């Protein structure tokens, strides 16, 4: 039961650690978005990034 | 009865040594509250800590 209980307190710190990390209200991490995208040319066309849900 | 006594003296120091253990005005091995909640975001999400009562 000890090990057990360890092992639902780190879940909860992944968890935590996973959803409090945002840059802007924006991440890459949390699943928040399926991707996102950022500008690579004059003209709009976006420099495509696959999220990963962590 | 000497080891009667000397069991109700180490009772009255577990008690006197659970009660003298607070930090700041807080505490959570006497069982003072039920929890405390620190922070862990700054939304104002909480860490949470159950108390012991020891």
Same mark, same amino acid.
């Given at each position: 039961n000890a #090990?057990?209980?360890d &092992?639902? @307190?780190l879940r909860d710190q992944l968890q935590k650690a996973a $959803?409090?990390?945002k840059f802007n209200g924006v991440s890459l991490a949390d699943? @928040? $978005?399926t991707k #996102? @995208? &950022?500008l690579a040319n004059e003209d709009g066309s976006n420099f495509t990034v696959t999220a990963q849900t962590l």
């Open positions: #090990l057990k209980a &092992f639902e @307190s $959803t409090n990390a699943g @928040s $978005t #996102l @995208s &950022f």
